[PDB]
Amino acid sequence: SKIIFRLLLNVLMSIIAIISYQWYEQLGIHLTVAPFSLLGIAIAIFLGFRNSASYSRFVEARNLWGTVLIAERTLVRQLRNILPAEHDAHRRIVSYLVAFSWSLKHQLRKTDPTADLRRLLPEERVTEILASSMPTNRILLLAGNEIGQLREAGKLSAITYGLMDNKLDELAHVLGGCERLATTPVPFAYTLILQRTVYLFCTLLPFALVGDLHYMTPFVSVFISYTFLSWDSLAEELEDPFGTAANDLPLNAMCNTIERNLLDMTG
Amino acid sequence: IIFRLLLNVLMSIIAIISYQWYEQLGIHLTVAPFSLLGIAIAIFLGFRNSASYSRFVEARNLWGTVLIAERTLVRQLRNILPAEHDAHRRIVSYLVAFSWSLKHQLRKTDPTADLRRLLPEERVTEILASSMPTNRILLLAGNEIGQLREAGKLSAITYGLMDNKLDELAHVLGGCERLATTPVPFAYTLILQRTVYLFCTLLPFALVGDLHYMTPFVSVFISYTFLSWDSLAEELEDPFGTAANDLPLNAMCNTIERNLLDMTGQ
Amino acid sequence: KIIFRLLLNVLMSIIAIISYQWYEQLGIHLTVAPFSLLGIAIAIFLGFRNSASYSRFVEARNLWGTVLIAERTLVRQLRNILPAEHDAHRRIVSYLVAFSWSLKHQLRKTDPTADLRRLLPEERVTEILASSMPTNRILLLAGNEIGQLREAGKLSAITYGLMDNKLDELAHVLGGCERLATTPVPFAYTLILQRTVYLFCTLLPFALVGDLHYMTPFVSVFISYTFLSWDSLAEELEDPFGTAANDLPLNAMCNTIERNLLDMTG
Amino acid sequence: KIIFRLLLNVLMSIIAIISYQWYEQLGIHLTVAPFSLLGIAIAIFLGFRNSASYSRFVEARNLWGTVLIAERTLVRQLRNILPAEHDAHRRIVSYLVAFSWSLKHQLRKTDPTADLRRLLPEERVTEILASSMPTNRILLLAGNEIGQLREAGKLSAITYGLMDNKLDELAHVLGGCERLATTPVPFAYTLILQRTVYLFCTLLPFALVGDLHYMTPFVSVFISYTFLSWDSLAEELEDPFGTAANDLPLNAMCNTIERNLLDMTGQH
Amino acid sequence: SKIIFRLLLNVLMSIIAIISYQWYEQLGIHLTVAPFSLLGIAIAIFLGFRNSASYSRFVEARNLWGTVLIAERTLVRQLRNILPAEHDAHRRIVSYLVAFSWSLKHQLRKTDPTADLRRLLPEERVTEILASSMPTNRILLLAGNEIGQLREAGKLSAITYGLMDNKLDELAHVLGGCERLATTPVPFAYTLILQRTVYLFCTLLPFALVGDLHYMTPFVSVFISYTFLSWDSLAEELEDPFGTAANDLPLNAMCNTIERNLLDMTGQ
Ligand SMILES: [Zn+2]
Ligand SMILES: [Zn+2]
Ligand SMILES: [Zn+2]
Ligand SMILES: [Zn+2]
Ligand SMILES: [Zn+2]
Ligand SMILES: [Zn+2]
Ligand SMILES: [Zn+2]
Ligand SMILES: [Zn+2]
Ligand SMILES: [Zn+2]
Ligand SMILES: [Zn+2]
Ligand SMILES: [Zn+2]
């Protein structure tokens, strides 16, 4: 959908290349294919590496969200297995854990967490969380308070308390990894130039292809332009994995899966 | 894969016998632009198959950890409570339930017969009532270990060491679920398949000038190696499938069960 | 500074356009086929190199991501288990925060004394800066604070150990950042490939001008822009701790850390 | 084994010369440009394939490394915690060494009887050999020894846990190696992926004569050597536990760790 | 290096080709550049992949050595933090930790450690350390005897004893990874291929260049051979990161940094 526009332009520069062609020698222009085949292969190589980097940002982001689900399930498991009777702490903690993940989606989508927070917590908490530098980080400190007082209440050994504390550390690592990938994107520094280069190549290519491909120029030029531009825009979607493009991650579904898992695990 | 090679032999034969008419419109196909495109395709094909490959390997890793963490959890119980064979058999049957249930979840098949062969039916009923049955099998197993802990037969220190093995099985379950629902992005294989198939049909048309009657044998050779490589990526999706090059999840589940049993004198 | 070299190449082309006609008396012939073998090879090497430069920048960010993660969870641990002991909260947070600023000045080679005096008594600042490894001594002192809690019976040996592991993480960060700063990417990779990228871009028109006559500036400028752009991209990524817009925003990261740790302790 | 295919390349090259005459007698032609597009595609796929093979080799290399690391530090812990318990030192050490040799035999699909019988008493050798997974049973036996030191009260639960971790590392090695052996990720495609390289290297002189009429054999086999080296080297690394020139020296590694452990308990 | 030698011979093959192009028609050799473009690009792809592997193993070697400093630092931190009064064991452990790094240097450089060992430790210990097949291993065992005796004097708990024991496990992983990088290089086929082919390709190339370019052949055939040989010889450096070459890790300075960190941390 994004590239259909500029594919048709390339058909036009192709028609312009075909109409302008017989005049090359009157206009003084000689444009052979060998120099463009060298330039095109070097962009291919560079598009290959940039796409590899983008995808691996995607794969990392997906992996970090996988750990929210893994580590919330097993903190709840350890609670049910060591303090089975305290359904009261069960429910408090699960709300923090469910809050943490919706809070994190908003942080990364850069949207308002007030609604989701009120749906799950008391409004005194909702405002303690909204007041923080980082709500997600505030939610974790709160979830740790819940576990801390069970230790001070003697319901946990220092060993079974260390076991659950380690799961909140796993979520701290998820939080940091998501902020690194969010706020430190792939260097934009050249993404502007990284893309300027690929379309400049696609319009000039028919002008250099016609001499060989007299009337087939618009076909082979559009085929070539398709592949180069598809790869470059996938590279740019996948490179903001928390974005809202169609190939980005489905953070809403993932927060829902997370909610259903913990609620099913406590009630 | 074998069908589209023949359409290529046809295209090349069409190109051969329609070659007379090439300058009628001034349509002319050079090899040069097609070798630029064929090289930009080989690169992207190379990178994609890389991701398909890494995805398949991760799934084999995950399943390998099942065997490892289950072997080592049963090892600890045998080494620490060599007397308590009742707990031995209980914990082994949950650990074997987990693999089978994970397999059935990944293949979206019913785990009921397997679960009943291993567990008492009250336990099966608790598991299948869950919207996440394999995750609940872990809660049960964690319970067996915990009452060994609450009955004083394990110290907090080794209880914690066994709980950690359960956390490893939890990472397998998550990673399988994440892989199952997170394919390599479809946009990748969409444009690879559009681009690879178009390029193979057009190719004999551009080879016919250079190779007069030789195009069918060289154009077919070129398209076989691109389609071989492209279809390798498709052999490495669905690692949890049932196909011949999909993982042998059943045989791996039998190995798991075979190990834990010979480990407890059965 | 890269744009400068573009215009030199435009000149190399117009000189090569006018240098061209006399080529007879010296007998110099330059086809473009050999130059496409060399430009391809350079592009392969430049792509592999940029990959290494990007992976080094990424590891820099991960390192800094870990101080923020490790300092947050150490302070959360303190407030979760000793929520009364705010006299140790303030001392440790001040140590954690000074570790970050000291780490930053260390990587940027600037006087840290302002930040240290702003966060610690002049007794401390005199002591830390007397050491040859100031960031290492801050970790040592932060280790004392937890250790004194360990002897004061306020922490078990277990949770004393758990907080020790967070200082360990910060020890690995200090080491990793030091290792990135002292061990630059093998310089053989930067200027020897900078020279061959440079030589290649100027010598390119003199080999193009045969096939392209007055297009040569237009096409040679395009190619050179491509190579010099990608090569300059690897320039930036590969000194991640530098002071430059594209480089890591260390001052912001340290302010976020300080605001987070204080926000966790009012 | 590959020098045979190189010589067929000089042969094919002589056919190309003495029959090129009659090629256009039919109107059949072979330029270089199509075979240069195809050879570059193959070279790209060879790089990626060799990248995957190599990373299989490095991982098998890291897992064997961990065997030596974990056996050394477990024996170190045993010596440092229980300096007096030499009978226990000796029993565990022979299990550790039995584990390594039995892992080598398991990966190479050879018989471990002689190494087991040199190191352990026959009641345990028949028990180990009876088992479904002998290396796994050796780990279980090593674990019983550490278990009875705990039940006898000679170890804290903590320091008993520090050594039990050492056994878990060896269990991860065992599983990683099992997966790197019976799980070539793709199979009978390497048959395709290398048959492709074989046919390209035979058709190459037919496509080279026109440009370079009798020089083809020297150029045709230079190129063939290049392509077939990279391919066979990929297949060597693909199977790191094999007996090839570029595969793992498991024997040197099993001998190093035996030598380390005897030197570590005062048997050298 | 030895590279500049090989650049000058390319000036000879070119002038040879310049002055022997005369006889090409008479000798019946035709050498289009096109087939050499296909070989060159192939080799460039393989060289690109290989350099990556070389660079990776170099980066890993620097990483391993970086952990020596981290693990030794924090071990000394834990000792002061946990048993601040025991400056006597502080000094013995640190001399072991210092001997470990110097011995690790000698082991990787394959040089005698006796001098550095004599400088740092009593004579009975130097003899014991030099007897072992792996002195770095024996040094870790000795440092661990120190920690162990502090545990059986009741001066450490089982937990804080564990906290410090982990640091020695870390050091063992360092030893193991370094030993692994030192004994397991990139498979030598990777280079013999890339050494024979890159060299052979670099000299046959002007012979193909002369017909297309006649007297420019030297200038351009040299540019190409510099690019390939730079990239390939640089790979060879990065593959022996523990080598005594100029571009290899500066192991002596890292052992000096390590010795000075550890002395600064302990009063001196
Ligand atoms: Zn986890
Ligand atoms: Zn509950
Ligand atoms: Zn494990
Ligand atoms: Zn039993
Ligand atoms: Zn952490
Ligand atoms: Zn406070
Ligand atoms: Zn270890
Ligand atoms: Zn002994
Ligand atoms: Zn460490
Ligand atoms: Zn001291
Ligand atoms: Zn001439």
Author numbering:
A (entry chain A): 22 to 288
B (entry chain E): 24 to 289
C (entry chain B): 23 to 288
D (entry chain C): 23 to 290
E (entry chain D): 22 to 289
Copy text from the publication.
Human bestrophin1 (hBest1) is a Ca2+-activated Cl− channel essential for Cl− transport in retinal pigment epithelium (RPE). Although the structure of hBest1 is still unsolved, two Best1 homolog structures, one from bacteria Klebsiella pneumoniae (KpBest) and the other from chicken (cBest1), have been previously reported. Overall, the channel is a pentameric assembly with a single ion-conducting pathway, which varies in diameter along its length and is constrained at two narrow points: a “neck” contributed by three residues (I62/I66/F70 in KpBest and I76/F80/F84 in hBest1/cBest1) on a transmembrane helix, and an “aperture” formed by a single residue (I180 in KpBest1, I205 in hBest1, and V205 in cBest1) on a cytosolic helix. Here, by electrophysiological and structural analyses, we show that the neck and aperture in hBest1 are both indispensable Ca2+-dependent gates, and their dysregulated opening by rationally designed or patient-derived mutations causes Ca2+-independent leak and elevates Ca2+-dependent channel activity.
hBest1 D203A is a patient-derived mutation localized on an intracellular loop adjacent to the aperture. Structural analysis predicted a local alteration by this alanine substitution, as the corresponding residue in KpBest (D179) is involved in a D179–R172 salt bridge formation. Notably, the aspartic acid–arginine salt bridge is not present in hBest1 because the residue corresponding to R172 of KpBest1 (R196 in cBest1) is W196 in hBest1. Consistently, hBest1 D203A displayed electrophysiological properties reflecting changes at both gates: first, the Ca2+-dependent Cl− current was bigger than that from WT hBest1, indicating a gain-of-function phenotype; second, Ca2+-independent leak of Cl−, but not of CH3SO3−, was recorded, suggesting an incomplete closure of the aperture (like hBest1 I205T); third, while the relative permeability of CH3SO3−/Cl− was retained, the trans-promotive effect of CH3SO3− was abolished, indicating dysregulated gating at the neck (like hBest1 3A, Y236A/C, and W287F). Taken together, our results suggest that D203 serves as a communication point of the two gates, while hBest1 D203A is a gain-of-function mutation due to enhanced opening of both the neck and aperture.
